[PDB]
Amino acid sequence: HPTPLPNPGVYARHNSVDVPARLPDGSESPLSVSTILPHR
Amino acid sequence: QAGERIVVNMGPQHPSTHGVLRLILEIEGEIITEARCGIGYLHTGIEKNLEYRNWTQGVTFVTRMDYLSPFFNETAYCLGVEKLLGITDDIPERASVIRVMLMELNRISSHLVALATGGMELGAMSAMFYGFREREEILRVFESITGLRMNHAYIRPGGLAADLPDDAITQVRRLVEILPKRLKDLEDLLNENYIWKARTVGVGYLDLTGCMALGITGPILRSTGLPHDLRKAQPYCGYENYEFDVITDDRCDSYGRYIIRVKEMHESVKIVEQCLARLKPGPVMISDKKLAWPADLKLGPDGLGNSPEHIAKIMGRSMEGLIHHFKLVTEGIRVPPGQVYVAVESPRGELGVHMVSDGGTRPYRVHYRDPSFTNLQAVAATCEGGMVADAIAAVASIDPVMGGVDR
Amino acid sequence: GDEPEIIAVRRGMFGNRDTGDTSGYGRLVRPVALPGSTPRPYGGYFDAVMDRLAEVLGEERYAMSIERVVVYRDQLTIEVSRVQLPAVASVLRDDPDLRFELCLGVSGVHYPEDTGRELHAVYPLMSITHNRRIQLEVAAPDADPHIPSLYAVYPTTDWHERETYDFFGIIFDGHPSLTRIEMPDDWEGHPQRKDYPLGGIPVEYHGAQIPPPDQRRSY
Amino acid sequence: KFLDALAGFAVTLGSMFKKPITEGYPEKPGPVAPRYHGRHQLNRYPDGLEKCIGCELCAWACPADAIYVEGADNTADERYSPGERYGRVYQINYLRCIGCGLCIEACPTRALTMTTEYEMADDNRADLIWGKDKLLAPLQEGMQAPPHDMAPGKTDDDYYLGNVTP
Amino acid sequence: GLEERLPGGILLSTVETVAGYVRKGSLWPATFGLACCAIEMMSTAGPRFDIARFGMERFSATPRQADLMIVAGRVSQKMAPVLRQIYDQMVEPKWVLAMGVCASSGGMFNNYAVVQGVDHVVPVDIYLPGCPPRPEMLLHAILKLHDKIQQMPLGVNREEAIREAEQAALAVPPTIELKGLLR
Amino acid sequence: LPSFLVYVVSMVGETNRAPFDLPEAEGELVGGFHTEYSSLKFAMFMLAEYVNMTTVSALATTMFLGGWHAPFPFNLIDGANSGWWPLLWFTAKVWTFMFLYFWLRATLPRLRYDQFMALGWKVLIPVSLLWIMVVAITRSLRQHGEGTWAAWLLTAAVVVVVALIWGLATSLRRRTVQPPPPQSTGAYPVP
Amino acid sequence: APLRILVYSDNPRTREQVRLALGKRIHPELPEIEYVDVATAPMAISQMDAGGFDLAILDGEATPAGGMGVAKQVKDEIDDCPPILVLTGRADDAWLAKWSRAEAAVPHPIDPIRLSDAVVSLLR
Ligand SMILES: CC(C)=CCC/C(C)=C/CC/C(C)=C/CC/C(C)=C/CC/C(C)=C\CC/C(C)=C/CC/C(C)=C/CC/C(C)=C\CC/C(C)=C/CC1=C(C)C(=O)c2ccccc2C1=O
Ligand code: SF4
Ligand code: SF4
Ligand code: SF4
């Protein structure tokens, strides 16, 4: 299953774990951010 | 639900994570529930930076990728170049023997670093110092042979950057004599140590099916009992003529991987003995002057330089010699267009190199399938559900060198 | 077509990328062709592999799926057709006669001068039971860089497919989450593409500076 | 006997009676290998003429672009090397030099060598851009100032063949 | 701190001398290796050498305890924020040692991915060549940092030194203008 | 001796010293509890740890090594136990315990704190409790003239313990082995 | 009152270039501009700590301490910090300029009108 679930995204000014990663189209990947976190 | 699980960074700056690896752990108190992996904190652009340099120059880049296994990266690169050139069958025997000797001494060095860093991660502080005494024993040989301690550019397309210094063979014989004893001194600290075994036995378990699924290779795969080693299956650089045992284990866990590394050190010492046994004098560079690295380094009272004989040849006598030196040094060989994927058994697994040439003097593509990058897919498998202290042991057992991971 | 793929067309002698430093030498036209399809009797186990593949797939499915077969330096490349990649990979992994358990990764390679085939993903596969190995190659256009992800067949590819996207923009449709793995999520461009500038800076010297290697002359 | 698990103690105790192995740097620096890739050095012929001919081959080969060379003409009024060219400017950016040694293999006159001297560090980004005057090897005995005519009757070929003396 | 509010007489001078001595003799590094140079840093701590000799055995794992940062590696773009965070999370006084060509100026990897010198993100006390710098070179650079630390002003002397250094720095012509024999 | 061993282990634990330096565990928690502390506050934590080392080693000397009595080679020497020499002997014994501490640091990994607690509750506590019972019975018998009956008990009891502990070590647990099954991911053939 | 702009760079020519792009009175509909020039990170930090600056221009290529690092520091350390403009020595440095949180970033070589427009946007 998602080998090792995708990491939270890294942005300029935001690298915390709560930051969701960006899919190619520009949407936010739900899997990158843990289930327990309240989005961002 | 949420409220009982914390989310923490093992983070880049953490003693166990080699500074540039980010394990994002969702932990229920202190059990790892999920282990996300964050990579690229050591990305260096090597795969692209290569494209603006010639062959025999990209070597200096590739040895920097997996900096613990420099000779393996360089051998993979130069074997790819030779395969593209079709020169794999023309390389001198002595160059191949030196290549095996250096790759195996590098395997000893890389496993020593792996064991040292793991032991200090798991509190075994003296592991670092004993492993590094042993490693310094080998790094002195590396310094003598190549003039560098790491990131050597000694292995070059079609041969080596130069031949062994006269004292090198005796230094390596001394290594073959002492490495058993110093390695035994290290083993006394860990091998049967009750706290060490308790800290790694059963920890980081990964099934053979798991290894196949994630593409794991190296000690992690062989700890499942599978005797898969690219040195025996798909031989390269003349390993076919060396008698050595593929080290394997049945524990499928961190301690199995540790024992595999400790035994692979001995197998490397045995292969090094064989190398010294079958090391006959001869050229270290292909005799085809159209491709051979033209420089002949020799020491003098004024330091390491081109040998004065070579200077005389190319500046006083040999016009074709001068042209070849000039062009092979500046422009460098131009490789026929084509693709080739060549793999070696790096200490951490199947280090593959996809090499693409566009007929030019610079590589068109050099992609390293570094084993560490794929092995880090196993952080989830070997950490999730276990203790964070056990996750540290698992990650150490993977022995990820982040330079190769991020390249 | 059996004509080779030309990834570049060298103009003039000495590898000049532009007009050239000596007059009258620029009129040569040397296309840069990768090897074309090997005739048929592929060396070693390659035939044994491909024949088996051609058996497990139908004649129609095999012809529609495998665009080319190229043996070069005793290395077998199967230029597979896009869209059909998951089926071929499933056949390779599952078939006992092929049984390529170990996919070693995915590597992107960009050929801007190869019309309609700009981005090639290379899949090195190894069969441990049979001690064999081959390389699948899937070509996608730049305008439609979408390739089918092999995740269901080779989970190991997940990160590789990610890196390859990050570095080339090859959109592996069907991948769980194609997030950039190496570069920051907010990074613009795909560095390993040729169109992406090297992004170096001049090296400083007392009274001078050397521009990066991508700006200075080359051959 | 359960003693094997305690072997580590035997190790550490034993080592605290064998002498420490640390090199005594800097009071007693360790022996670096003769082949070590130390600081580049620009050398001279026995008569003192600079070996470098400013061909920029060393800088050509440098993967790091860590060498900057500008050539200039030798002339009777001012001659620095045998032959028509010499390296008037010769800088090495040691904050870009990776010590690879490709420069050395590139040099066709052995003007560039690598010493075993390695101590180098400065507080300025610019103090580590070492110029020609920092690199030229010390003017040994029997040598004369670099700006002078060739040894009498000798010619550049005589220099490259090693047929020169103070 | 009050130690810097002493009058500019002998009290402040002796306090500066003793504090510089102590800070140079107890210059704990942060456990912050990055790359090749991190391996050479571990080798420096290794028995063949002994960084502990210089009071630097404790590679501080927490940035709070660490007084020195051996960058010792190549700072990718994605690492510059993290490296800066670690730096800012050390407690003053703190010095930074750019170990290696990668850390000091980007080294061979003059590319998009590499920051081209941690100087971009953190003040650098000492630059150290090498790729990697051998452990003897690391010890040399650390001793040069010891010399820099001992001769360190405090209080009113610190302000005077900052003013003098600023005035001096405004005059140096830039490296690109130091055209010597370069035609 | 059993009480001495249990106390010394519980001691090395109490001071948070390796192989039980778990609260810090620099290899796992970076700096553990003293992360976020710098300057004299961290210095105070570490000074407290070292003073705890000194206190517990001094207690170990006091209640297992005759406290300040001179060792055997100086036991026969006149006045070895008088004046200031007892201070020297006490410091010597305390520093032998200090050496034991340093030696433990230099030759052992650190347990996982769950493993350490399992040690404490499955080895240390049972052993100490059974030793207390055995010693009580031994003293009662010696005070009741049974004599040999105590020696037969004492020697036997430890002999039994040394077995059952090894039972929890190798002869009954922590020395087993198992296998596992493959999944659907087309796994290779293990020779 | 006059606006004070802290221009930070150890390269004197970059400071002169910034002072040229911005005249004594940029956008004559705006107040006069006063220039305090600093060539060291400690001095730049101390001047910021003094405060009263309307804008600070930090050369991202400053040798001993880059203007991006100084930008992040000044935003983390001075309450009510004035807006920061950064000169970036590389186009790929934009990401770091984003991380530095500087209100704007002007690539080298300093384009006079671009820098003036950026400053006017920040000081308005
Ligand atoms: C005429 C005459 C005879 C006069 C005598 C007057 C005199 C000298 C007085 C003596 C009595 C005193 C000292 C009174 C003055 C008042 C006083 C006590 C002030 C205290 C002030 C204070 C709290 C701090 C200032 C410093 C100080 C002197 C404090 C007490 C002594 C000590 C040693 C305290 C803290 C230092 C300490 C114990 C730990 C530092 C932290 C660490 C990690 C230590 C070093 C260290 C450790 C411990 C590792 O574990 C380690 C492991 C592996 C590799 C490396 C290391 C490593 O580096
Ligand atoms: S050092 Fe050697 S290669 Fe470099 S310019 Fe001088 S002669 Fe040419
Ligand atoms: S050692 Fe290598 S990087 Fe340094 S100047 Fe010589 S060729 Fe260039
Ligand atoms: S400077 Fe050289 S040795 Fe140091 S990290 Fe960079 S590539 Fe590795």
TrEMBL record, chain A:
Residues of the full protein shown: 203 to 242 of 252
Species this protein is from: Mycolicibacterium smegmatis (strain ATCC 700084 / mc(2)155) (Mycobacterium smegmatis)
Subcellular location per the Swiss-Prot or TrEMBL entry: Cell membrane
Functional summary from the UniProt entry: NDH-1 shuttles electrons from NADH, via FMN and iron-sulfur (Fe-S) centers, to quinones in the respiratory chain. Couples the redox reaction to proton translocation (for every two electrons transferred, four hydrogen ions are translocated across the cytoplasmic membrane), and thus conserves the redox energy in a proton gradient.
Protein name in UniProt: NADH-quinone oxidoreductase subunit J
The organism's place on the tree of life at top rank: Bacteria
Family, per entry: Belongs to the complex I subunit 6 family.
TrEMBL record, chain G:
Organism, as annotated: Mycolicibacterium smegmatis (strain ATCC 700084 / mc(2)155) (Mycobacterium smegmatis)
BP term (GO), one: phosphorelay signal transduction system
Protein name: Two-component system response regulator
Domain Response regulatory per the UniProt entry, residue ranges: 4-123
Modified residues (4-aspartylphosphate): D59
InterPro entries: CheY-like_superfamily, Sig_transdc_resp-reg_receiver
UniProtKB keywords: Phosphoprotein
